[PDB]
Write a protein that binds this ligand. Structure first.
Ligand code: ZN
Ligand code: ZN
Ligand code: ZN
Lengths: 551, 199, 93, 83, 99, 104, 550
């Protein structure tokens, strides 16, 4: 009765096999199950691993998974000359299946600042089939609509929404792995050397590297460059979309807007209540030009040495305060500050009054270079954002006393139990219990001393570290397993009530005032689709906690 | 109703039965295996109709009995969708009716939605009554020639329980099982039900 | 026959015998079958050491062949039967 | 798929002594399970020595499936082999 | 059992096994080692490869694909001592007869 | 055990009754507790070369055609019960024309 | 009514080896062993439920019965249980291979410490058709010593030293490859000692020995993040759901069946299982009442010590000690084993019986039987053996009917009644007769001719009498040594023994194709003394001498 078979699954294999078995069929899950469980795979390798589908029925799925961006392939060859495609998986093609209810209700809430209209029903409908078809142009969607009063309306909001982000065209860089896109680009700048060049080999290595570093950042921003918007007034409507491009959705602008949703939630518990609203519009303006939640240059390798991580932290702190969009003052907020703020009329001097208070808090919300020019730090706040929410998931679940030790161990950072009860104020068996229920998770390690020759625990005192990444990666996937378990029990419940749901779709297409049935099962259907909507409620609640540690 | 089915199988001929003709020696073993027995998911076999292909008899190092791979055809009671079938009424239960078929296949059930228009059960005499007309109340009596159309066959995959559970129910039995294969008969249209209404 | 001089000691049989239970009766310690479980090896039951461990007949000597009892059908009565409803239904459709 | 037609049977026409022991051990196993014998047994009861009689007059109704290491198999009747 | 002052049992061990392999006598070796020393009718499972009781598999609660085989009891005793050491000898079975 | 195809062909019940009468002559000891009982209970339960032509000339469908020669309709409503769309798919005058085929 | 049941005779084609999951151990379990109380002493020392020796796990006596299959000691197959360990411990058999994958992962984010360009190069070397066992173990070493070469990760900026042993501890030193460089890991390292060493400098003497330890509560949690696209690059192949590397840490422990460890006197394994349970109880109750970290580790190193003694114990026998030695399983129960229908007797000479015969004592022939299955041809013969019964030699000890699956003992009852009712398929066990195939060896069995096959001959003394020309392959003489007679029991095993192992067919050694059964020491002398040049015989002496040999 207790799900113990699922306690032994790889929680990303158990997740990714469930985000496609519910949405796609049970054949797409079998393919992408092997791609997670075996890495890179050919087609002639998948037909030897699956054993239950032949060489063409897997090719039915491969041309459909790439439609939904769930496969990030590569078409490369050996030295003999046979071009063998090694299909991979990608997570962001699966996360759009995971965030799929949040993406629609984000673009609804972001498109309430441009038109007071039913676009919250209408722009939700256009984004509903940019995801369910993955890649599409505009005119095939314009082919299905007939009324030009609405056809011009949807074509207007296409270029309006794509103006401020959320949609870019598809490319091969969307379907090629970043670490293999990097090394081929790294080898463009290696064989371009003069033959028998007198440069030393470490400098020969660095000549290939920093030439490719700005070259790698160039290729990523090529879809971020707005060349798709270039269809300028052929008869009217000074900017519209390009028809011949296949227009997809990006996630790096959504997650960036999703990160900004987290930071206003941190601010509501530390720095006032009305001034956090001022903080909300502040980050909402300087939003699209913000750096990503995760540099794709990190996952290309490049951390074999110590200095390139320092080189990454050079440009990471560079962009948060030396970007022409990301430098703002208290003057610019009132241009987009709406009405009904009621900060007791609004004026930029009182804005700078409540912009000063977002500097003096211990959390680096808004530091400043110039006294009017404020900016939000990202390399300094995001490694303390996740440290704050991790302390309260421990506090909510393991009691509030477990929060006390998890910070007392954090600053003292090699503390022992003789020093705990000096710097804590509980009874010692209560200390030795709530610490014991906290080593079971990776929130603390234990640092032993070998007082004797061997590392004996008889006469030895133990010390207590608090590692960041071991405590986080465990909490990252304790949620990710719980996120996947919850969809497993969703799908198992819908599949055992299949003869109800088949009757609920066929006999009563319209006649649901009586169901053309008995009232002894519509109440039973009521407690199915309530739990079927309550499970996605707990999904979105959990997904906000999970996405913190993704950054 | 009666169809044939190409079935491949591995038979065991004990070596005392080598004196027979090898055609009749195979079919005797096949009739031991298939007569009066539900083939899973195709219905009730009756006899073995012919033989199509035998191999050469292969032997284990265990015993001397030869093992022949044989493919054959057998008669099998599989009535198709919507077929007018007769029978003889066994008992009128409260929720439906079960009708015998002269010991061949007695697991027939006709539910409420498969009866006539307005049939009600009488617990005082265990009989179904249908109010036909001004002369309303007709009689679904017991052990007479019935006429009814089947609707759907069912394949109850019977499943043996655990030996700790198989023995505890056997222990308390000393002081019903689900039929593996059954039919959903119906009396929707006129002409159905009793044959005496239309003989 | 593996290209080098192997020898009939413990390393030479490991080159020869890719199996687990044949080398297990060779050994005097026990960790030859823990990395059989770790690296998840999957051996056949072909060699005569593990044939008699698992109790099934080795394939040398009298197990080298198979004995078959020939049937005396000779395609005589393996003509199929009538089924003259298909002669009826050919005229139907 | 796999078979060898009896005009291109490559192997030996002589009965291997390992074949002779399983043929007599099989046929004696059948005879002890009440199988009918084909030789005029002169009042003997033991199922081995009856089976040795049948191999002398070549009256033993078995064939031998000589498997080849590729997967093929030749079939040789026991009255065809040379003992 | 062991010894002389019991009922008895004469050990056939590791060196006469070698002798009857050299004769090629394969059913004697099957009989003298398994059939008349320790024969054991056991119930394997076909999808798991583990041994079930009473025609019933335990690691998959079904009597469905249980096969009944004869095996040396010392090989049964071996497998249940390997499952306790946390290795799993999973028997992979197949049919004896070509189709 | 494998069933290769579930329905090789249909069987008109005269073929089955002709088969099992030959089985009773062939099996007259050969006592089966299961076979000999059920092959007796099916032949009393079930209780041709000229009728196999005129039904096929009517262009009725072979699925429901077999039940005409399996059990014989003693009434017009039973003949209505076999063929679906008896009044709509074809005319009325040939329906009683099939009735003397039943008596013949 | 009833379903067509079918069965095919099958055959083992392979063994597959893997560890079990925590879900595979529970799925085969019948009880969860939770108490150390073997017996409740108030109910006459009966085996207490949910402890060890619980009757759902099997039975040790033939009087009591099991609680799962309800079979006695003869027919119970034995049933497992399991045993949930709080604070998991390292498996002692996989402890070498727990090391070899900690030498292969990041130890911060637990990603593999390899680049991609050689990774897909390595996977081509392993997925190729030319892979053998030690070939793959050679590649898996070739990709492990290469993995110990790289000093940082590709996924995070952590640096990684070496990881090795310490008994049952695993120790990572992050440093020893920093030299003088690699500041920020060392900076937070030497920064955090100043919170302690500036308080109590007694621990300053032990700073060079304090390294980053890897206890099984965080070695387990480090294994749960290896993201199994590269477990096959650790030699795992994680397509199987028990592939995953954290299945090699003892979270759950199977309690073996009571058939594996009986009670004659508790067993060595039964007393080890309770000790493991007791330690787990001390640990689980200690984690909630509040115990110190100094004695939590003292118990949890002791719990790991017991399970280490449970498998190896290297003076009690573990499980590995039951499998090792020439008295253990592999040579002592699987290759060699005491057999039935055998006898052992002093040998003795007999020139009068043929070279293919052996003289069996008629006291052994009364106890060594043959399962003669009755037919048409020996129906009258076996009826005479029934009525003679077990105590005269042309006789029989048992009778096993066609269906009654229990041997009627001919010592009791009316034997004339059972002889008229002798069917055509039921087995008598008749006494060893003249001409039965027997086996016969000397032990020490040096060569192939050291076990041969004869025809029995039934004689009135108490000793085996082979011919003297046959004592050369056994390499024996008549000085008090003994031989071993084996009576085969099946018609196939009786016919392979007389035809392949017969004396007349084995008259030559296979070593060189030379005669090995020929005239012995005293049959060469009497033969030389006849064919000596001056022996002359008349008709009276000659024809008497020709009648000696005939
Ligand atoms: Zn199983
Ligand atoms: Zn039991
Ligand atoms: Zn790393």
């Amino acid at each position: 009765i207790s799900s113990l078979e699922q306690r032994t699954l790889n929680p990303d294999l158990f997740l990714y096999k469930e985000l496609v078995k519910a949405h796609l069929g049970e054949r797409a899950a079998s393919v992408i199950g092997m791609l997670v469980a075996l890495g890179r795979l050919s087609v002639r390798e998948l037909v030897e691993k699956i054993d239950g589908m032949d060489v063409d029925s897997v090719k039915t799925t491969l041309v459909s998974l790439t439609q939904l961006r769930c496969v990030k392939y590569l078409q490369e060859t050996a030295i003999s000359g046979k071009k063998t495609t090694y299909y991979y998986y990608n997570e962001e093609g699966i996360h759009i299946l995971l965030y799929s209810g949040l993406i629609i209700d984000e673009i609804i809430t972001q498109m309430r600042v441009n038109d007071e209209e039913e676009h919250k029903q209408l722009v939700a409908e256009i984004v509903q089939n940019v995801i369910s078809l993955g890649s599409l142009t505009v005119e095939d969607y314009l082919s299905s609509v007939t009324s030009d009063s609405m056809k011009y309306t949807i074509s207007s909001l296409f270029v309006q929404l794509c103006e401020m982000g959320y949609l870019i065209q598809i490319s091969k860089l969307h379907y090629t792995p970043i670490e293999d896109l990097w090394q081929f680009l790294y080898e463009k700048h290696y064989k371009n050397i003069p033959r028998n060049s007198p440069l030393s080999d470490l400098k020969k290595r660095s000549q290939a590297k920093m030439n490719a570093k700005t070259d790698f950042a160039k290729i990523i921003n090529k879809p971020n460059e707005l060349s798709q918007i270039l269809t300028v007034d052929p008869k009217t409507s000074l900017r519209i979309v390009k028809p011949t491009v296949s227009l997809t959705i990006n996630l790096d602008r959504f997650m960036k807007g999703r990160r900004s949703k987290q930071l206003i939630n941190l601010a509501k518990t530390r720095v006032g209540s009305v001034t956090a609203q001022v903080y909300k519009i502040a980050l909402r303006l300087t939003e699209q030009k913000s750096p990503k939640i995760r540099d794709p240059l990190t996952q290309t390798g490049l951390l074999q040495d110590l200095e390139e991580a320092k080189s990454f932290q050079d440009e990471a702190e560079l962009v948060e305060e030396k970007t022409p969009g990301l430098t703002f003052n208290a003057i610019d907020l009132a241009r987009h500050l709406p009405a009904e703020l009621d900060l007791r009329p609004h004026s930029a001097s009182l804005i700078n009054s409540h912009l000063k208070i977002l500097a003096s808090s211990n959390f680096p919300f808004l530091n400043e270079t110039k006294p009017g020019v404020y900016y939000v730090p990202y390399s300094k706040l995001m490694p303390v954002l996740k440290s704050s929410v991790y302390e309260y998931v421990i506090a909510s679940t393991l009691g509030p006393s477990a929060m006390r030790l998890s910070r007392c161990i954090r600053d003292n950072k090699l503390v022992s139990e003789k020093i705990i009860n000096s710097t804590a104020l509980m009874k010692e068996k209560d200390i030795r219990s709530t610490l014991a229920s906290l080593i079971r998770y990776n929130s603390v390690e234990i640092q032993e001393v070998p007082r004797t020759a061997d590392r004996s625990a008889s006469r030895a005192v133990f010390l207590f570290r608090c590692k960041e990444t071991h405590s986080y990666n465990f909490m990252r996937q304790n949620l990710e397993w719980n996120m996947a378990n919850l969809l497993f029990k969703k799908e198992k419940l819908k599949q055992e009530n299949s003869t109800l749901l088949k009757k609920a779709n066929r006999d009563d297409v319209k006649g649901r005032e009586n169901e053309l049935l008995l009232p002894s099962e519509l109440n039973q259907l009521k407690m199915v689709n309530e739990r079927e909507l309550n499970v996605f409620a707990r999904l979105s609640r959990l997904l906000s906690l999970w996405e913190v540690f993704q950054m | 109703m009666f169809i044939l089915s190409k079935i491949a199988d591995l038979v065991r001929i004990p070596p005392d039965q080598f004196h027979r003709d090898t055609i009749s020696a195979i079919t005797h073993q096949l009739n031991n295996k298939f007569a009066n027995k539900i083939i899973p998911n195709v219905g009730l076999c009756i006899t073995i109709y012919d033989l199509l292909t035998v191999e050469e008899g292969q032997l284990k190092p265990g015993d001397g009995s030869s093992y022949i791979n044989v493919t054959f055809r057998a008669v099998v009671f599989k009535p198709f969708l919507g077929e007018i079938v007769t029978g003889w009424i066994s008992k009128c239960t409260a929720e439906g009716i079960k009708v015998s078929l002269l010991g061949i296949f007695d697991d027939i059930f006709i539910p409420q939605n498969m009866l006539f228009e307005g049939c009600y059960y009488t617990p005082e005499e265990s009989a179904w009554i249908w109010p036909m007309d001004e002369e309303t109340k007709l009689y679904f009596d017991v052990n007479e020639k019935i006429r009814f159309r089947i609707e759907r066959e069912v394949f109850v995959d019977v499943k043996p329980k655990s030996p700790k559970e198989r023995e505890l129910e056997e222990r308390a039995q000393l002081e019903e099982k689900p039929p593996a294969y059954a039919l959903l008969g119906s009396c929707q249209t006129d002409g159905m039900g009793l044959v005496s209404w239309w003989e | 026959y593996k290209g080098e001089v192997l020898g009939i000691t413990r390393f030479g049989l490991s080159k020869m015998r890719d199996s687990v239970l044949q080398l297990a009766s060779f050994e005097k310690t026990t960790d030859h079958l823990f990395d059989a479980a770790f690296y998840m090896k999957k051996d056949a039951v072909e060699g005569v050491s593990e044939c008699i461990i698992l109790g099934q007949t080795m394939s040398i000597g009298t197990g080298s062949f198979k004995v078959v009892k020939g049937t005396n059908i000779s395609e005589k009565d393996l003509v199929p039967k009538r089924c003259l409803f298909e002669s009826l239904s050919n005229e139907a459709a | 798929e796999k078979a060898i037609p009896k005009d291109q049977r490559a192997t030996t026409p002589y009965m291997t002594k390992y074949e002779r022991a399983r043929i007599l051990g099989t046929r004696a196993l059948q005879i002890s399970m009440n199988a009918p014998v084909f030789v005029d047994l002169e009042g003997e009861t033991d199922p081995l020595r009856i089976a040795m009689k049948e191999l002398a007059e070549k009256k033993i109704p078995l064939v031998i499936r000589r498997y080849l290491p590729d997967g093929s198999f030749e079939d040789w009747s026991v009255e065809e082999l040379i003992v | 059992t062991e010894g002389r002052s019991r009922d008895g049992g004469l050990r056939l061990g590791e060196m006469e096994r070698d002798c009857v392999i050299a004769y090629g006598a394969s059913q004697l070796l099957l009989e003298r080692l398994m059939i008349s020393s320790d024969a054991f009718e056991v119930d394997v499972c076909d999808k798991c490869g583990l041994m079930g009781y009473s025609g019933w598999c335990t690691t998959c609660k079904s009597a469905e694909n249980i096969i009944k085989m004869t095996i040396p009891y010392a090989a049964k005793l071996l497998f249940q001592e390997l499952l306790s050491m946390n290795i799993a000898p999973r028997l992979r079975l197949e049919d004896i007869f070509q189709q | 055990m494998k069933v290769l195809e579930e329905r090789n062909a249909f069987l008109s019940d005269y073929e089955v009754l002709k088969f099992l009468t030959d089985l009773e002559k062939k099996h007259l000891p050969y006592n089966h507790p299961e076979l000999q009982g059920i092959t007796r209970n099916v032949v009393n339960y079930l209780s041709f070369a000229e009728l196999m032509t005129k039904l096929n000339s009517f262009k009725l469908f072979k699925a429901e055609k077999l039940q005409i020669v399996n059990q014989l309709p003693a009434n017009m409503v039973h003949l209505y019960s076999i063929v679906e769309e008896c009044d709509a798919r074809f005319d009325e005058k040939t329906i009683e024309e099939m009735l003397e085929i039943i008596s013949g | 009514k009833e379903v067509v049941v079918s069965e095919t005779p099958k055959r083992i084609k392979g063994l597959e080896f893997s560890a079990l999951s925590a879900a595979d151990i529970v799925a085969q379990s019948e009880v969860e062993v939770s108490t150390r109380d073997l017996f409740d002493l108030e109910k006459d020392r009966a085996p207490k439920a949910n402890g060890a020796l619980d009757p759902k796990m099997g039975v040790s006596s033939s009087s009591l019965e099991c609680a799962t299959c309800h079979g006695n000691l003869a027919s119970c197959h034995g049933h497992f249980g399991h045993l949930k360990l709080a604070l998991p411990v390292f498996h002692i058999g996989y402890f070498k291979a727990t090391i070899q994958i900690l030498q292969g992962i990041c130890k911060n984010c637990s990603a593999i410490l390899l680049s991609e360009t050689d990774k897909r190069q390595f996977l081509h070397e392993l997925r190729r058709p030319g892979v053998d066992n030690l070939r793959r173990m050679g590649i898996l070493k070739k990709i492990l010593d290469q993995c110990k070469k790289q000093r940082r990760c590709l996924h995070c900026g952590a640096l990684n030293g070496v990881v090795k042993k310490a008994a049952l501890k695993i120790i990572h030193d992050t440093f020893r490859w920093v030299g003088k460089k690699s500041a920020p890991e060392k900076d937070i390292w030497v920064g955090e000692w100043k919170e302690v060493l500036a308080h109590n400098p007694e621990l300053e003497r032990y700073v060079k020995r304090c390294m980053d330890d890897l206890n099984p509560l965080k070695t387990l949690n480090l294994f749960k993040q290896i993201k199994s696209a590269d477990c096959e690059l650790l030699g795992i192949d994680a397509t199987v759901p028990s592939g995953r590397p954290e299945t090699y840490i003892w979270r759950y422990l199977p309690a073996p069946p009571v058939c594996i460890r009986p009670s004659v006197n508790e067993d060595d394994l039964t007393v080890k299982l309770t000790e493991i349970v007791w330690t787990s109880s001390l640990i689980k109750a200690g984690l909630d009442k509040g115990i110190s970290i100094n004695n939590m580790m003292e118990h949890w190193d002791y719990l790991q010590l017991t399970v280490a003694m449970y498998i190896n114990s290297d003076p009690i026998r573990g499980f590995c000690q039951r499998l090792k030695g020439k008295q253990g399983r592999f040579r002592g129960n699987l290759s060699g084993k005491r057999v039935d229908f055998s006898g052992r007797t002093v040998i003795s000479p007999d020139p009068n019986l043929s070279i293919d015969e052996v003289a069996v004592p008629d006291r052994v022939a009364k106890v060594l039987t043959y399962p003669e299955k009755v037919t048409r041809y020996n129906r009258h013969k076996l009826q005479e053996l029934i009525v003679n019964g077990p105590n005269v030699h042309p006789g029989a000890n048992y009778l096993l009917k066609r269906n009654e699956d229990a041997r009627r003992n001919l010592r009791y009852g009316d034997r004339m009644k059972l002889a008229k009712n002798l069917q055509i398929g039921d087995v008598v066990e008749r006494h060893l007769e003249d001409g039965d195939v027997v086996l016969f060896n000397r032990q020490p069995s040096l060569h192939r001719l050291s076990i041969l096959s004869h025809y029995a001959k039934i004689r009135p003394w108490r000793t085996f009498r082979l011919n003297e020309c046959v004592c050369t392959p056994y390499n024996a003489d008549f000085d008090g040594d003994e031989m071993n007679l084996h009576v085969p029991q099946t018609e196939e095993a009786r016919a392979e023994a007389i035809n392949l192992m017969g004396v007349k067919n084995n008259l030559l050694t296979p070593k060189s194709g030379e005669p090995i059964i020929a005239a012995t020491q005293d049959f060469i002398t009497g033969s030389y003394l006849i064919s000596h040049k001056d022996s002359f015989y008349d008709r009276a002496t000659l024809t008497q001498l020709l009648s000696m040999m005939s």
